[model samples]
Target: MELRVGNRYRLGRKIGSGSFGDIYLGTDIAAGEEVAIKLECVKTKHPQLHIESKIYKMMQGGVGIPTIRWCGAEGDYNVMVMELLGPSLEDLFNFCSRKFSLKTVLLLADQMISRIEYIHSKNFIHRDVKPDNFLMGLGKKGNLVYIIDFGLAKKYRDARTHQHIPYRENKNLTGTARYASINTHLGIEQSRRDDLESLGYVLMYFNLGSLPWQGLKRQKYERISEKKMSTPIEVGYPSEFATYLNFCRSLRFDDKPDYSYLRQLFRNLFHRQGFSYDYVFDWNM
Candidate 1:
């Protein structure tokens, strides 16, 4: 069967899968261009693609955000058509034999901070902040890092009142266990700070190959939280990491993060280490 999305995109190969949907690399018939098509089953009761597309709409012009070419439902599936991208950070890390250079991590850190900052500015918290969600662009945009997967994104504040969401606990873990913030493991309501903390752990994972709590049996999440609590984030390599971790973990539930300060700290570290933020990532060289 030659299946077509919106009669514009011709579905090709299955590229990835989510909880209730599949991602296919498709071609736009109108312009003869490549695009990623995500299809979620209509009967899933909870339609994540529809929700994801809405967030994408809200963040259309934001930095590092991939613009959706189209979003709608047809047949028995919900569809999303967007620009095609290259491999994920996780994929690149596996190719690099699991260890990224300090320069690479810092450069990635700068982009990661920028993406999270933009998301926070839009009043939404990217609960699932992990390597898999951060993808590299293709062709002329190859050097840039783009964040993806807004299925777990949440608005932490009211758009009108700007009243921050009240603090609450006893919520189930929201994001990936490996890179989740300690507060997230504690079952607290996630906020911008958790996103920063989660990214901090991701940076450490890139530098150290794996987190301290990783590789344990299914006894993770809880035990991982335990280890996360006891572990000092900046035990080696650079002091900037320590500074970054402290700043992220110390933020209040609704405090406006010093995004400039966080970005500058890493920029200083990048400059001090005598490296340029030339978008020439580790994988490039």
Candidate 2:
């Protein structure tokens, strides 16, 4: 790839890599700012870079989402420039020894739920919702969490009609299988509920260190769901966690999710447990 893009940004060393391609740290000469550039091969199976750019454009000014700085082609690759952020939730989870206290989990849940609700309001469903895609902010913004990587995101509503799209079946699995919803394993089309369901799995994983399906790759759908359903919620975490998971599972494929009530669930639990939003996360200390 070229060392510079648009005669403005000077490419630096790679900061990360994904299925799409390499992500590099870059310097914006004109603005004197540091940004992250996601470079995707033009011959790739899908044009995920362009799709993510459109989604970011649609989500401009929305809270908890990275701002896209620039997007264009650079020789054989499509490049997307975005705000550089901090370590992902996955990194932080492991940094904390793969375990999160109840207070930390509840605080993280509040942020994740709000982010999902905003994405849903924009008519998009984050088909892939997992820890690796959610990151912490840098420096002054470190206390806040931001959601990233919309490569697998899909529109769940019709653009012109603004109506929820009809559900379909026999679809291929679209996300990280470990945290996917039961409906996803059954090859059902994902919607808002699926995103929230995946979030439920993530929260549990934070609290429990690992999920039952972590190493059981491609196990039968019925078996995986059975194990997931039977996994017990321990005493330390609030019952609201169970309620959240159950509610996510109970939604019909086309049913609209009650985003407000879902956010309130965590808020109520935080109040009940006498936890305040002090921004002192588990990782902070």
Candidate 3:
């Protein structure tokens, strides 16, 4: 059912629209605050919108996830309102392409990891974690990066919680194929480790502005079957970036990496002697 945009929401303007639905910058009549209302397309009850709503409900003001102002089905459309964040990570990538610096990359990694740590602690895997999902918030600083669009998120019930969901060990395939892990590409149920692998790719992409693997080298099954756990940097790319890349590779599918260790590694890339950063904290890029 088509939602009467003006009636359903105090929509000021149509900002964007995609596979899921249309996004409008609206005003909550009750609260009198500005928010982005995602009016999901009514096409056979897609679970992405529901999953996104659940993820936001679970957040409960947890910081990284956008604060949801409203959500419900109105006029055959599944409408969910969330804080309007400007300039996606895609924008950041474009910006980085021209002025990409090491200090900027370090800061990005820090904030991204900080959000990831929280997601893991809650036993929720952001299956679609990527740069595009990262958003810059209301503040002008551009330092705060919020992970948006939890359409592909999954809540795993491991031994950590008693509500058993049959312990489905991941075969992996759920997110964007370009940046997804080998396991995910094979249709495996994902775990927290898969998210880390995807994040590693994002980190690498942030520095280089593109994914390492592109085009079909082999068949779909063939790619997944022989997918290497290590990347080119892990194999020897020749740079301080390679060391951090290998460190990220060490976070295997079964490994729950300690954030502190990763933090030290990030700092090592910055302040450690004879590496990328000098003692001055200047961008050696």
Candidate 4:
């Protein structure tokens, strides 16, 4: 399992590890640059392999996802080669203070939702989309945030069609139960809207810095319940930010906000400092 320093890839010390395998900072001999190699466990080769590979392929133009170096099985271990990036958003959230501009949050949502739409367009869903999967680049203040981990991701076609999936109160196959939508626990078929609902929770967390249902005195039945459930922005947030927060919260798997609505909102926010699309319609020649 050991390769020479000047071999195809010079193996360095380990940097990160997860449910699938450990990530090592390696030097790609030919590329002559540092890269991250995610050593996958044998279990990854199961039925889920197709979805993983498909996600990698479908996300080719995604904004901030790591560039795929290579993917193949090394004996029983499957290794995925990608760009080496630094700490995840979860790590940053814990270390950084409660200070971020509204512009930053809106930008984050625009990029995140765009990526989500891309994945959904491919007929797959990333059931778990949270700050944990987001990673910053080498710089501290990153203009990019990459989405990693496709273990719990599933194809929309297959996940649908099954019924009687009871709403789960606790986290099931995925880890973070608090952000999960009620329909996710029930084992029902997932939709693009379901992913949006989770994104809404993330936006709320960014605003409130705490989960909506984390330490509630109410029971699970009362928590996800309509009458009891309320968004964090309702407590406090700027008008524009709060408006978007409410829009995201109103999302449901059956029916949710469309791309047009989001696109217009993002356009307005991005143009707050004066910008225009005049170039496209310039026929004054």
lDDT of 4 by residue, 1-285 (tens): 678333567788898765356778898878876788777567654544445656787677666756887777766666777767767766765665644345555666676777777666656678887888777665542556677777677765543563223333444435355666555545445555667767767777776787756665534644554322454456555455556546655666545348667756756765784544332111111
- Per-residue CA lDDT of candidate 3, range 59-95, in tens? 7677667887768777667788886786777776675
lDDT of each: 0.87, 0.85, 0.65, 0.63
By lDDT, the better pick of 1 and 2 is: 1
Q: In terms of TM-score, how similar is model 3 to the real structure?
A: 0.77
TM-score of each: 0.95, 0.91, 0.77, 0.73
Candidate 1, residues 185-268, lDDT tens digits: the string is 888899989999899889888988998888776466778878878887654779888888888889988898998899899889
How many clashing pairs in candidate 1? 0
Could you tell me the lDDT of residue 76 within candidate 3? 69
Better of 1 and 4 by TM-score: 1
- Candidate 1 local distance difference test against the native: 0.87
Q: lDDT rank, highest first? A: 1, 2, 3, 4
Q: Which pairs in model 1 have colliding backbones?
A: none
Model 3 clash pairs are 170-189, 171-188, 171-189, 172-183, 172-184, 172-188, 173-184, 173-188
Off by over 4 Å in 2: 217-226, 229-236
